[PDB]
Amino acid sequence: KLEGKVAIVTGGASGIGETAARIFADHGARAVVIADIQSELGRMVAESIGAKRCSYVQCDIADEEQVKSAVEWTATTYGGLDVMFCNAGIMSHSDSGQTVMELDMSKFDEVMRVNTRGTAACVKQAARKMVELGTRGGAIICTSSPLATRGGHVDTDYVMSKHAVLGLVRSASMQLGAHGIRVNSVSPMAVLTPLTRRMGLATPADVENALGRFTSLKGVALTAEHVAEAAAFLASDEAAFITGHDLVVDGGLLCLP
Amino acid sequence: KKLEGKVAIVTGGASGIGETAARIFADHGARAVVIADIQSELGRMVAESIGAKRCSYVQCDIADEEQVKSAVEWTATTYGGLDVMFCNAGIMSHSDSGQTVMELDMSKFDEVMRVNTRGTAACVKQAARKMVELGTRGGAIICTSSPLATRGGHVDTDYVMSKHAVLGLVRSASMQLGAHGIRVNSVSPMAVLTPLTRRMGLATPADVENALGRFTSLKGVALTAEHVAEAAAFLASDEAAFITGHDLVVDGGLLCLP
Amino acid sequence: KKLEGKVAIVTGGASGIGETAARIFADHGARAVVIADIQSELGRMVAESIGAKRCSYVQCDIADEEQVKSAVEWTATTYGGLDVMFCNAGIMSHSDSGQTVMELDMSKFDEVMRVNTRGTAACVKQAARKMVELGTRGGAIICTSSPLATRGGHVDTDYVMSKHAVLGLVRSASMQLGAHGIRVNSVSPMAVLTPLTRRMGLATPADVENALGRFTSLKGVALTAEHVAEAAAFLASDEAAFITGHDLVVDGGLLCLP
Amino acid sequence: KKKLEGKVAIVTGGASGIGETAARIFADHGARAVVIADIQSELGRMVAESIGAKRCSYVQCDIADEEQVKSAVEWTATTYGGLDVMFCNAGIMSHSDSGQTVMELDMSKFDEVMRVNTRGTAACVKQAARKMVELGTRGGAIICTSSPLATRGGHVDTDYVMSKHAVLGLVRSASMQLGAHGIRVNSVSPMAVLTPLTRRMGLATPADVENALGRFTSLKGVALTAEHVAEAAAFLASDEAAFITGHDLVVDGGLLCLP
Ligand SMILES: NC(=O)c1ccc[n+]([C@@H]2O[C@H](COP(=O)([O-])OP(=O)(O)OC[C@H]3O[C@@H](n4cnc5c(N)ncnc54)[C@H](O)[C@@H]3O)[C@@H](O)[C@H]2O)c1
Ligand SMILES: NC(=O)c1ccc[n+]([C@@H]2O[C@H](COP(=O)([O-])OP(=O)(O)OC[C@H]3O[C@@H](n4cnc5c(N)ncnc54)[C@H](O)[C@@H]3O)[C@@H](O)[C@H]2O)c1
Ligand SMILES: NC(=O)c1ccc[n+]([C@@H]2O[C@H](COP(=O)([O-])OP(=O)(O)OC[C@H]3O[C@@H](n4cnc5c(N)ncnc54)[C@H](O)[C@@H]3O)[C@@H](O)[C@H]2O)c1
Ligand SMILES: NC(=O)c1ccc[n+]([C@@H]2O[C@H](COP(=O)([O-])OP(=O)(O)OC[C@H]3O[C@@H](n4cnc5c(N)ncnc54)[C@H](O)[C@@H]3O)[C@@H](O)[C@H]2O)c1
User: Fold this and answer.
1) Which end of chain A is more exposed for a tag (fewer CB within 10 A), N or C?
2) How many Cβ atoms are within 10 Å of B94's Cβ, its own excluded?
3) What is the DSSP secondary structure assignment for residue A154, as one 8-state letter?
């Protein structure tokens, strides 16, 4: 699917991004660059994938200059840039849950900084590099959420940030189609990662107990591989005419708990 | 191979998008692909070309629920299962006034609604019932939709209403059949060169670009039946094991209808 | 007064939401309200109660396009105008197996689709033709829809499909009739205590609260037919002069269907 | 009865444009008191004096400063004895030669647009809700001004598009969380209203609007006015909308696509 492509995975040191980097390489990616802020964790992932197929770059995506450097380093080292997986994202793990009435505006600022400013800087810098290189069939994919299209009972800062990511995806797909660049998102429900266990979901039983009643599809558990497979489809020529689309991977979510 | 060992029915498989999907499903390793359709000899030609040991042709007017029952049951006992139902058959009216609201021909409305909604509903029902009987694991039902399932049209109002209805069927069936591990999704392509769009006036890739090009964000690629079949194959495979109730839009970033 | 001097037709006005809309339209100053229904005894009682100088009954099965045309003609001729068409009549199956996909009764599907999609389309068409013919300024066409026009259902799959189709009609009619200054919108209420919901087993406010209370964000108020009528009167008035193609949802923040 | 009889309303950004007209229309619909919160002191006191000092007051309030929002909300509730309507209407767009396209996104201008439109709006919803809960307000209403660009992408002003998407996420979440208190939260999404903001974008006259947007607008024979937007807001703020929450009320004349 991805033979000969060069991909960057922000947040690739952990969770969904880690699995996505592994799966992109299994799909024949020429090179996968993990861009994260967890240097030793990230280097670990890179060697696990294979030090000759995967590299790590320290990159705080909220700092546009660090994004530009990571993008430039990637294109120079590997001679191209075909896939930007804008995946890094954070939540506030606030004791009072970031409800509207208890909204911690300082914690709100942190979430919006990473999830909207960082994602926007990543889309911008990746687009600029693909255009400069004349990349053909380039793909930019943002990790979203069902909370990009419906409200939350908690984590209001996160909900607003993912709504904003969807607006960015829609706008970028409109503006970058002229260059043949496709911009899409993938919105998974609950994946066991370090993020979801900070919310109190550590085991598949925790997931089913929290969400199963609200999930239409029975008899299958959502894995990080599932999310990576959706993203590899979007990045591949199997999706050559798909842009501006939010690919939802949620088992028919009826509502949040 | 993503469809290895699966048994697929493709309605409307004698022509256009359905024909390509049947070929592409077989190329992705489907054990058997059954074309259900009403163009008897165009369809036998296709199953012939795909490989008479991989592909059969069944006469099936999808509006008739007993013919859908029969086609589904024939497929399952012949090949020992049913894993994928690609509910793709569908029509438009091709009317002098264009089926604007002002000039809606109620009789032609009835014909479009009969195939596109009653027939699609019959296929989803009969395919689902058989999957549950056989105990199919990870079954997939996929309906061909349209950007006109989520937006209004300037013309072909009956077709627009029918595709809106198909989307409601997909959403409802996903919530009801998830208990059986059956996933239900749709694929919504924009303009594919088929006999249907030829009846509309689009014969050549240059016609498509002249009618839809300025309304499409993505430049440098034309949509093909293969693209739609690849979207469906993805949805039918384990690559989409947790995707249900979803409308997979393949429109190049359609800004608006012309 | 919001609707001062306007002539309105309310289909399904003999009962439930339509009856309350007819009364509320008159309270907002409508010059004439015409109730179009198939329950003549009930409908004549509503018309007489609103006021025989202000309100008339016409027998009209909206699934028969000729009866619709006749009712619209009679309204414009009797009252010299047509400003508001509230296409509100609709039905459900009330089947013992709930019209799930697995147990979908196609003949009952046909009945629901006939009233809710074919009939609604004929009403939109015939009202639009008449307002265009009269030169109506700022005419309004409103269809009663449902949260099930935008999400799937666990039951009543035929009704879900039909209300999706109604939204496709509203969107299409909005884009085609705006050239004439005609606005087309829908209103989508959740559970109102009417003969329709009584037939689904909801007879009392406690029944509604038990079925839907914990799926509804908004507490302290129960949806009434008057709430729905006020939404329709807003959309029908100059308070909504630039609103078209819109589905006005009146559901209390519905988290999910039961 | 007047649609807003007896209600106390706050209108942020009420010194100008849509918010000024909303303040006038709310008073016209019988609001007991309208408080204009803005950062244009002389303009805002003009509006308040014009509506009538007995029924309208002005407060200086930078909505991106949560403390000033809380202070304006407390002053309203203490002065007038209640808080029934919060119309979170203040917002900005960037001054950008490059249009804030993705390719030329000025990140520091993006920051400012997000700070006012998302951080400020969130603070306004929070502080208004906290007060209505404290007061035991019955049938309270919080309305945010949104845009078609809350639900569709834009060719330009990408920062603004993301900010309005985020506002809709706030409206949806607040609706879900505040319904327990009887508080309804909705948005109103107008297309092109002639204001100082759209003049800055190059739309100064009705002909400008028609030339830029007429062929993309289904509804003919009428042009969107600020009064139309205010009437939609007044509806949502009233008992005519007693069961409407979490809803985006679109006022765009059937917009077929963005320019
Ligand atoms: N896990 C879920 O269930 C779930 C569901 C829906 C959406 N998501 C989203 O998927 C993305 C990945 O989430 P995850 O579950 O793998 O969480 P995770 O915490 O396991 O991984 C996130 C990684 O992003 C990195 N990160 C944080 N800030 C960064 C920054 N400024 N610059 C660069 N990297 C940064 C982190 O170091 C981390 O390695 C996130 O956008 C999340 O919002 C997750
Ligand atoms: N061509 C496009 O650009 C386009 C765009 C959007 C959606 N679609 C939809 O994709 C589906 C296939 O369209 P197509 O372009 O391949 O058109 P097509 O006419 O070339 O193929 C349709 C086939 O379905 C068969 N058919 C019609 N009624 C039938 C019935 N009752 N029972 C069984 N078969 C019946 C027809 O014989 C035909 O072989 C349709 O549902 C169409 O609405 C097509
Ligand atoms: N909770 C609710 O009541 C609810 C919720 C959502 C949507 N709706 C929709 O609101 C509309 C009215 O529903 P209601 O609850 O008032 O039901 P109701 O049964 O109380 O009233 C419906 C009236 O429509 C008339 N009707 C049926 N078929 C007709 C036909 N062919 N021609 C003319 N009239 C016909 C009926 O005789 C009846 O008087 C319907 O479209 C319904 O789908 C109702
Ligand atoms: N005019 C349009 O076409 C249009 C369309 C859709 C949405 N909107 C939105 O409507 C809102 C009002 O826009 P408008 O056209 O009336 O513009 P406007 O500039 O005429 O009025 C906005 C007023 O908000 C005040 N404002 C800005 N930042 C503020 C802050 N931090 N604190 C307090 N007040 C502040 C401003 O001084 C100004 O008086 C905005 O949210 C805009 O996004 C406008």
Assistant:
1) C
2) 12
3) S
- Between the CA of C175 and the centroid of ligand 3 the distance, in Å, is 26
Chain D nearest C-alpha distance from B200 (Å): 22
Residue D63 near ligand 4, beta carbon < 6 Å: yes
CA distance B24 to B3: 10
| Residue among C11, C17, C158 whose CB has most ligand 3 atoms within 8 A, to mutate | C17
Per the document, the length of chain D is 259
Chain B contact for C92 (CB, 8 A cutoff): no
Name subunits touching B (3+ CB pairs < 8 A).
A, C, D
Residue B8 token pair: 């697929």
Query: Which 3 state secondary structure label does DSSP give A191?
Result: coil
Residue B198 makes CB contacts below 8 A (sequence gap 6+) with none
∠ CA B63-A252-B239, nearest 5°, is 90
Q: Write the CB contacts of D97 (distance below 8 Å, at least 6 apart in sequence).
A: none
Q: Which of A7, C235, C53 is nearest to D249 (CA)?
A: C235
Written as one letter, the residue type at B95 is S
CA distance D51 to D34: 9
User: Cα separation of A208 and A82, whole Å?
Assistant: 37
Q: How was this structure determined?
A: X-ray
Q: How far is CA B43 from the centre of its chain?
A: 16
Cβ within 8 Å of residue B138, ≥6 positions away: A220, B83, B181, B183, B238, B241
Distance CA C195, CA C190 (A): 14
What is chain B written as a DSSP string?
-TTTT-EEEEETTTSHHHHHHHHHHHHTT-SEEEEEES-HHHHHHHHHHHHTTTEEEEE--TTSHHHHHHHHHHHHHHHT---EEEE--------SSTT-STT--HHHHHHHHIIIIIIHHHHHHHHHHHHHHHT-SS-EEEEE--GGGTS--SS-HHHHHHHHHHHHHHHHHHHHHGGGT-EEEEEEE----SHHHHHHT--SHHHHHHHHGGGBS--S----HHHHHHHHHHHHSGGGTT--S-EEEESSSB-S--
In the DSSP assignment, the letter for residue D198 is H
User: Is the minimum CB–CB distance between C39 and chain B shorter than 8 Å?
Assistant: no
Tell me the C-alpha distance between B121 and C105, whole Å: 10
Contacts of A254 in chain C (CB under 8 A): 256-257
Q: If you write DSSP's letter for every residue of C92-159 in order, what string do you get?
A: ----TTTT-STT--HHHHHHHHIIIIIIHHHHHHHHHHHHHHHT-SS-EEEEE--GGGTS--SS-HHH
Question: What's phi and psi for A72, nearest 5 deg?
Answer: -65, -50
Cβ of D253 below 6 Å from ligand 4? no
For residue B131 the two structure tokens come to 């999957």
Ligand 3 pocket: which of C9, C10, C11, C15 to mutate (most atoms within 8 A of CB) = C15
Residue pairs spanning B and C at CB distance below 8 A: 142
Beta strand pairing status for D184-190 and B84-87? unpaired
Q: Does D170 touch chain A (CB under 8 A)?
A: yes
* Buried b / exposed e along C160-175 (16+ C-beta atoms within 10 A): bbbbbbbbbbbbbbbb
Cα distance between residue D105 and residue B111, in whole Å: 51
- Which residues, 6+ apart, have CB-to-CB distance to B135 below 8 Å? none
Nearest to D257 by CA among D100, D148, D99: D148
Distance C229 CA to ligand 3 centre (A): 13
How far lies A60's CA from each of A19, A159, A164, A202, C69, in Å? 20, 21, 19, 27, 67
The Cα–Cα gap between B156 and B95 comes to 8
> Contact, C46 vs C20, CB < 8 A?
no
To one decimal, the resolution in angstroms is 1.9
What distance in Å separates the CA atoms of residue A46 and residue D241, rounded to the nearest whole number?
Answer: 56
Report yes or no: D8 and D30 within 8 Å, Cβ to Cβ. no
